[PDB]
Amino acid sequence: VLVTSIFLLLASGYFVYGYLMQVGVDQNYEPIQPIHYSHKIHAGDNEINCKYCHSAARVSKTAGIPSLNVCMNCHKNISEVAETTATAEYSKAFYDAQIQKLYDAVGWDKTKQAYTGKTQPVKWVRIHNLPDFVYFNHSQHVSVAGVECQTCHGPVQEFEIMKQYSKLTMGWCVDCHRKTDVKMEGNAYYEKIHAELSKKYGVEKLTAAQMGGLECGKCHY
Amino acid sequence: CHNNSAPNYQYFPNMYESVAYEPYTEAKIFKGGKEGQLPVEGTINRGFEPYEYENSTAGYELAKANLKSPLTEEEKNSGKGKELFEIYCISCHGAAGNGKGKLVEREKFLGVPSYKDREITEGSIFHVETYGLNAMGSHANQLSAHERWLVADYVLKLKSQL
Numbered sequence: 372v373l374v375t376s377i378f379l380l381l382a383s384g385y386f387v388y389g390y391l392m393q394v395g396v397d398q399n400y401e402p403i404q405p406i407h408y409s410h411k412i413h414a415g416d417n418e419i420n421c422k423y424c425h426s427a428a429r430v431s432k433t434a435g436i437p438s439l440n441v442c443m444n445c446h447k448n449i450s451e452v453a454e455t456t457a458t459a460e461y462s463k464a465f466y467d468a469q470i471q472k473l474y475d476a477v478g479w480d481k482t483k484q485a486y487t488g489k490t491q492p493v494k495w496v497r498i499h500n501l502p503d504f505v506y507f508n509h510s511q512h513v514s515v516a517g518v519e520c521q522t523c524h525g526p527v528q529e530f531e532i533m534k535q536y537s538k539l540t541m542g543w544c545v546d547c548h549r550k551t552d553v554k555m556e557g558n559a560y561y562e563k564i565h566a567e568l569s570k571k572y573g574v575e576k577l578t579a580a581q582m583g584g585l586e587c588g589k590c591h592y
Numbered sequence: 593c594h595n596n597s598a599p600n601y602q603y604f605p606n607m608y609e610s611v612a613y614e615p616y617t618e619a620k621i622f623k624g625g626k627e628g629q630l631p632v633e634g635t636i637n638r639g640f641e642p643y644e645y646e647n648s649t650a651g652y653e654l655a656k657a658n659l660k661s662p663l664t665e666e667e668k669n670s671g672k673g674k675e676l677f678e679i680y681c682i683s684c685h686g687a688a689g690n691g692k693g694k695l696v697e698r699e700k701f702l703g704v705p706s707y708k709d710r711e712i713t714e715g716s717i718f719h720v721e722t723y724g725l726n727a728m729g730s731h732a733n734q735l736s737a738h739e740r741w742l743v744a745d746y747v748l749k750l751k752s753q754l
């Protein structure tokens with residue numbers, strides 16, 4: 372009987388440690404947005420480019436939610452949706468009576484094609500969060516290092532509703548820094564460093580353990 | 593236990609929520625419910641000039657006639673003007689062609705002309721790219737004042753190849 376006793380003790384450890392390692396993790400998080408916005412029709416079927424709505428990724432650290440002025444310059448001429456886009460779950464009248472909710476937030480009127488003077492913003496639900504001791508900046512992490520826009524937030528164009536893809540818990544930031552390279556070809560900031568040590572030490576360096584990106588004052592100060 | 597339609601449980605949230613005011617969240621004290629209060633009219637921050645031509649039919653052709661590009665030849669031949677056209681413009685206008693785009697094939701909305709049909713100067717792009725001519729919108733919210741001129745040189749190179 373001791374063999375099965377040991378087995379159960381080992382299993383017991385497994386189902387405690389595993390629990391504790393999955394406390395501060397928010398994978399596969401899906402709330403209910405007040406509109407039913409679809410990243411699948413816009414970014415996947417129409418092939419709208421990814422930087423269009425989310426425009427602040429190049430300059431600022433917060434690639435924010437697009438404001439309701441971007442929701443009008445495409446949607447002045449699109450009132451109804453289609454006839455070959457409604458599915459088994461979603462009908463045409465579900466979409467047409469919900470694109471009208473975009474007109475109530477801005478104040479657009481369908482009849483005489485003019486703005487009214489009553490505006491209400493849309494309370495979105497933010498699904499990617501970090502505690503506010505970290506310092507992540509989208510600007511020097513997309514424009515400087517040429518990272519593709521699906522390798523951090525998942526294959527976003529194949530989602531009907533939005534889902535958090537990665538876990539963001541401090542051991543995914545370190546792990547992707549161990550196995551990548553800084554871009555030293557184009558930048559003139561690296562001419563003092565990259566032309567050096569090719570004569571002395573080596574051809575290229577990783578990000579984490581060489582430039583110094585694993586120090587407690589560069590990420591949370 | 594952890595559900596997926598609600599966030600997961602936490603162990604002593606010491607420094608997780610914010611005492612300061614991170615930009616887009618909701619507050620209670622402000623004028624609206626927002627956190628992005630509008631600046632006062634008529635002020636000027638450091639590194640920005642206000643556009644001095646008003647809206648269409650009286651300031652359109654006045655901008656088309658006498659308005660020039662304040663760039664240099666070092667910045668035009670950089671390739672950054674092409675990359676901004678690759679993002680913000682192929683969805684209606686064509687990439688190498690004019691008017692073919694991605695959305696008159698799918699027939700979602702019609703009425704996008706070519707660049708052979710309408711004669712446009714280098715100052716007449718910048719007046720439309722900030723205001724829009726009856727079916728466009730203000731792309732000033734997306735691009736910056738140094739970057740609208742980088743697009744305008746690339747569009748002139750697209751008309752010359754047509």
Ligand code: HEC
Nearest residue numbers: 404408413414419420421423424497498499520524527533
């Ligand atoms: C306009 C047609 C958009 C395009 C192009 C892209 N996105 Fe988007 N995104 C858009 C809206 C209106 C929202 C609001 C929230 C919602 O669920 O509708 C978003 C949100 C995101 C998010 C999550 C935001 C958060 O708080 O965590 C992500 C991660 C995101 N968008 C990514 C993303 C990518 C990778 C895109 C290129 C394929 C992209 N978006 C394009 C609207 C639009």
Ligand code: HEC
Nearest residue numbers: 444445680681683684703704710717720725726727728731
């Ligand atoms: C879909 C909403 C478009 C986007 C994205 C861009 N353009 Fe556009 N543009 C669009 C239409 C439907 C029209 C014609 C409107 C009309 O009333 O005739 C235009 C027009 C132009 C023009 C010509 C303006 C003129 O006075 O003749 C130019 C030079 C132009 N658009 C440039 C342009 C640029 C640089 C864009 C990227 C920022 C861009 N357009 C996007 C539709 C749409």
Ligand code: HEC
Nearest residue numbers: 407408409412419424441442445452453456466470473700
């Ligand atoms: C705010 C969110 C936006 C912005 C930035 C754009 N559109 Fe859309 N759009 C919007 C809503 C609320 C809906 C209906 C709900 C849904 O999930 O579909 C749509 C839908 C469309 C459609 C109709 C789909 C169909 O053909 O059946 C088209 C077409 C479409 N959107 C195109 C489009 C374009 C070209 C945009 C410019 C980038 C754009 N959208 C932006 C609201 C919003």
Ligand code: HEC
Nearest residue numbers: 425428433434435497499500501507512513518519520523
């Ligand atoms: C395409 C543009 C991208 C790229 C390549 C990445 N993200 Fe980022 N991401 C993006 C959007 C539109 C948002 C929502 C903005 C918001 O403020 O919620 C996010 C969000 C995040 C967050 C949460 C924001 C925060 O904690 O302050 C993090 C963290 C985050 N994204 C991380 C991240 C990483 C590590 C990326 C790798 C290059 C990355 N993102 C890319 C859109 C885009």
Ligand code: HEC
Nearest residue numbers: 506507516522523543544547551552553578583584589590
């Ligand atoms: C957690 C948020 C992440 C994740 C998941 C990734 N990165 Fe990294 N990254 C991050 C911080 C706080 C910094 C700044 C550190 C510093 O200034 O030294 C960086 C930086 C980089 C860099 C260096 C940029 C430069 O050349 O100046 C590179 C290169 C880089 N990050 C790449 C990279 C890759 C390929 C990732 C996998 C998608 C990745 N980061 C994830 C924070 C975080």
Ligand code: HEC
Nearest residue numbers: 395501502505539540541544545584585586587589590591
């Ligand atoms: C020195 C030790 C470091 C190093 C260099 C970095 N981190 Fe950070 N970090 C550290 C601790 C002890 C914690 C947890 C504190 C807590 O009360 O939970 C963190 C936390 C993060 C988080 C949040 C993780 C979560 O919410 O569960 C992120 C995200 C994070 N750290 C990112 C991050 C990045 C990008 C760093 C640069 C490589 C980095 N950490 C360094 C201790 C240390």
